[PDB]
Amino acid sequence: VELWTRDLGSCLHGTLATALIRDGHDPVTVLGAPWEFRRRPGAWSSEEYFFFAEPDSLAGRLALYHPFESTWHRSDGDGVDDLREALAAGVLPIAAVDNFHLPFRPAFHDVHAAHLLVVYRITETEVYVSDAQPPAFQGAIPLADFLASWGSLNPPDDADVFFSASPSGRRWLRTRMTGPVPEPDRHWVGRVIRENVARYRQEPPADTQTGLPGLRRYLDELCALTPGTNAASEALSELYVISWNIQAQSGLHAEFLRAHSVKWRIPELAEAAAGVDAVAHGWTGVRMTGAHSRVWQRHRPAELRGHATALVRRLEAALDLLELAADAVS
C-alpha cells in the first residue's frame, strides 16, 4: 500500500493514486493525462475531494482517458463488515472521514473537515488506514476512532467554512480498471493533448462553465459580486473548494508532460509543462486572495481581478504551447 501525493494535491488524487499503484498502474499517466476546467452552479459540496464528474463517475472523470471507474457506497449498520468484505475481494476501500475524529490528523478534536483515506486491513479491534496528506500516516487506529470518523456528522465549523457541514455518512469509494490501460505511446500522448486543448477551446452550451470560455465567465461572475455580502462569501467558499482539485490536476498534467519530455527527449513537452505549471501557479493567486477575503475579511477585489485575468492569460499561453507539443509527438 503506497503513500502518494503532491504539494498541490488533495486526498482525492492521493487515495486514487494508492488504489491505481496497487493494481500496477502509473498514477502520473492515469490522473495526469486529463486537464480541464468545469464549474456547475450548485454542484459543489463542502468536501476536500469535490470534483465535478457528471456524467462520468468520480474516478472516471479524473482518469478520462483510462477505463477507470468508481461507485459510491453507503454502509448500513454501525460496524465495518462491508469494508471487511471489500478487502477480502481485493478492493482498497476509500472511506469518507472527518479529520476531527482521526487521532493522527492535526485537526484531531480541533477542526471538522470532510476528507478521504485508504483502508487496507481490519482486525477485531483496529482499522489500518493509509493517508499521504501531510503529515503522512500508515497503520492501525482503534476501531472506535475509525467508526467515529466514518460516521461523523461533520457539523458546520467556524474554523472550517470550506470542508465542514458534509457528513461522512459511512460513504466509501470502490474503484476498478474495467479493462487493460491504453498504451501511453507518442501517438496516444498527442491525441490526449489535442483532446484537452479542443475541450478547453470549446464554448460551453448551457449553465455548466467549461474550458477557457467557461473560466473567463466564472471569474467575471465571481469578481462582479460585492465583497462582504452572503452571495460573495458563498462564491469564495465554492472557489476555494472546486479550485483545489482543478489546481491539483494542472500540477499533475505538468508533471505528466515533464515525464514524457525526459523519456522521449522532446523539448516541446517540457516547454508545454512550464505553460501548464504557470496555470497551476496562477490558481494560487486566485485561490489564496479568495481564501484571505473569505476567512479574514481581507477584501481585495482589485488583487482578485488581477490574479483572475493573469490565470486566463496563462491558460491561453499554455494551450498554444500544448499544440506545439502535440505537433512534436505526433
Binding site: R6, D7, L8, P134, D277, M288
Partner: protein
C-alpha cells in the same frame, strides 16, 4: 572549447525590511493563535528559525534575520517598493515561502527610468518540493496550528535567486503582488568584473 575565468569579490547588501513587516508567519508556543502564514492560521515554529536580528548565511549568502514585532515578522507581498543603495547588481536573493507554490514578478527600477520585470517562483511552506530550483533555507520538523504544535510536519522556507541582466544603476525593487507570497529576508549581490584567468 572550455576556458578558465576569474571574477573579483562582489559586495552583499543586506536590506533592512523591518519597516515593511506586515504579517505574522512565525509563532512561539505562547502565541500559537497569532499565526497568519495561511488562511488556517498556521505558522513556522520560532524555536526552529534564527534569533531575530541575527546574521545568518544560507548556501553562503548572508541575510539579516528580521527584528519582528507583535504584528509583523515577514513581508506578505503586496507590490511594496524597496529602496536599495544605488549600484550595479547581478543577483537578488530572497528567503521566502508561498501558500502553495506560485510565480510572480520582482521589478528592478534603474536611474535612467527603465524597469525590468524579473520572474520569481516561490515554493510551498507546507512540506514543499522546490518547483523553481530553489535551495532549502529552513525545513522545520514541526508546524504551529492555532491551538497546538504539530509534530512530524515540516514547514519549508526557500532561498530563491533572481538575475539582474541590465548593465545599469538600480535604485529600488518592487516585491510581488501576491498575498500567497512571504519574504523573510532580502540580500542583493553587486556586479563583479569577470575575465579570462
Amino acid at each position: 572549447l572550455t576556458l578558465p575565468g576569474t571574477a573579483s569579490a562582489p559586495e552583499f547588501r543586506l536590506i533592512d525590511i523591518d519597516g515593511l513587516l506586515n504579517n505574522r508567519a512565525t509563532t512561539d508556543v505562547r502565541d500559537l493563535g497569532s499565526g497568519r502564514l495561511n488562511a488556517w492560521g498556521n505558522s513556522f515554529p520560532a524555536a526552529e528559525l534564527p534569533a531575530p536580528g541575527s546574521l545568518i548565511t544560507v548556501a553562503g549568502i548572508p541575510f539579516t534575520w528580521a527584528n519582528a514585532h507583535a504584528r509583523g515578522d515577514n513581508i506578505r507581498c503586496e507590490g511594496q517598493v524597496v529602496d536599495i543603495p544605488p549600484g550595479q547588481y547581478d543577483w537578488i536573493y530572497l528567503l521566502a515561502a508561498s501558500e502553495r507554490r506560485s510565480e510572480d514578478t520582482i521589478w528592478a527600477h534603474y536611474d535612467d527610468g527603465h524597469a525590468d520585470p524579473l520572474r520569481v517562483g516561490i515554493s510551498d511552506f507546507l512540506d514543499g518540493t522546490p518547483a523553481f530550483g530553489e535551495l532549502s533555507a529552513f525545513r522545520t520538523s514541526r508546524m504551529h496550528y492555532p491551538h497546538h504544535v504539530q509534530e512530524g510536519l515540516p514547514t519549508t522556507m526557500w532561498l530563491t535567486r533572481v538575475g539582474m541582466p541590465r548593465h545599469g544603476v538600480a535604485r529600488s525593487l518592487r516585491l510581488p503582488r501576491s498575498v500567497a507570497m512571504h519574504v523573510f529576508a532580502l540580500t542583493l549581490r553587486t556586479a563583479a568584473a569577470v575575465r579570462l584567468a
